Design a protein around this ligand. Sequence first.
Ligand SMILES: CCCCCCCCCCCCCC(=O)O
Length: 582
Amino acid sequence: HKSEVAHRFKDLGEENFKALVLIAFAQYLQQCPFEDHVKLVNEVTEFAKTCVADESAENCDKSLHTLFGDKLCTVATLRETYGEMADCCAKQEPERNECFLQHKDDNPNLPRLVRPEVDVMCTAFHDNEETFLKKYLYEIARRHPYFYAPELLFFAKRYKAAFTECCQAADKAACLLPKLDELRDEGKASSAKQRLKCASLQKFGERAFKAWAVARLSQRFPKAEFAEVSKLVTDLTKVHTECCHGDLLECADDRADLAKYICENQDSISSKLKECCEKPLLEKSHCIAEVENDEMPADLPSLAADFVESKDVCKNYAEAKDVFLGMFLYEYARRHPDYSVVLLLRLAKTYETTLEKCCAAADPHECYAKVFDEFKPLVEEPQNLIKQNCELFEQLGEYKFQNALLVRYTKKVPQVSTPTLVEVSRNLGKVGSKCCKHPEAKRMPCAEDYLSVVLNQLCVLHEKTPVSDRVTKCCTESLVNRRPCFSALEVDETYVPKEFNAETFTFHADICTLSEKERQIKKQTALVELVKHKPKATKEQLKAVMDDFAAFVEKCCKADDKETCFAEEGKKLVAASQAALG
Ligand SMILES: CCCCCCCCCCCCCC(=O)O
């Protein structure tokens, strides 16, 4: 078109246009005050409106990158506030914008955003609803410069709905609070996954990414032809590559194009794209990415026919190794949407290895004939882990379950920091409840989606402050042996217990007046500390001490005299316990 600006305005709409402009500027000029950005957004918005009325109006023809960069260099304190970045303005558009991307701070040092009081929030909302949401939109954006703008906007709207509903409730807090905790966790998971996909692409390369995408896509579209999956896996890989680099526009168009291609060739891909393809430009991509698995054709022949028994398997394999393997993946994937993606790549890798040994032997059709038999143990392992952990989670309840893990992992890596072991075991328990609630069918895939982010959030910490060679062994290992490696860890027999510390086991009656969250985090921290002091304790010796401490609380926080009870009755517990646990 003649006007790129007028064009984006026209289909985005004024409301979405304005919110995206704000997020965009906030992600670059992360140091300017909110009132400053509002000024820009309005400036840009009024311009856009000019072009929509006459695509010929001066400058209406400039490119978005050009118009954007031009406005960015308009900032007067640019050099004084950002310094080096101001030098970008000396370059010409190809490099200028590339320069801006470079000087983007992924982890700025801004103060943690504290959550105000429901009533203060609801009142700010009611008075000035817009500036309330835009002010917070701007605060999240400057802190997460690499969060895909359109998706940040999708969360924004979900927030506006919670305040809309809850601030009318008789019991606002009971309404709002649990919704905000939910949204918080979601956006955090989304942020991590997005940062994870770009990391792997860099570390493991295109091949591994391609295989992950193939198994992934073949699961959602079991009816498409390998040729179609091939095409998509190809465009997709370019999209993530683009998107990871950073340019919002390049990444936005790449996704739009691919979303339209999928919708046009819809009948050629899946039957569950009905909705997503009827949706607005801004939501088409996001919808599709979240789409449910299409029913896999019911008429699907065997795999042993084309991969184990037929004779020219080596002939077809040597001719094009990757397409053959991609074919195995596609076939096995679309047949098993109840498998995690890493389980599939774990099977594909096993097969590849086997073909490499046999296609170079007297009679291969008999060297690789017992491969499928080697898949059995690979599949049963993650499966036996799910039942076992969901069975347990059922006999205990989230909290009591989180406690079981605590004892488990503290024993494995006692070297790890207590506040870390607690945070980790808490997130694991959450995964236990978020997934064990599904039928066998969707369990494994659920666990992988969640476990993936936790294991990495956990590995990144260790990165900054190493502690155990072992946790480093698994953290550096292949993204396919990441989880299996952690499950393989064994009780540390090397570790040397910590010297007693009464202060660590001294409780004053403030716990009785603390929130559930706080009481638990407090009892849980003593638990980690208790295991670090007496590592060889039994599940019995422990369950006992935990019973005595259990009652204790009730006896001192339901008694006329608190701190005395907590200091006179307490001395009794530690004295007895210290004896029981030898
Ligand atoms: C050296 C022995 C000191 C005894 C201290 C006991 C601390 C254990 C706290 C465990 C609390 C379990 C939580 C619960 O009962 O719900």
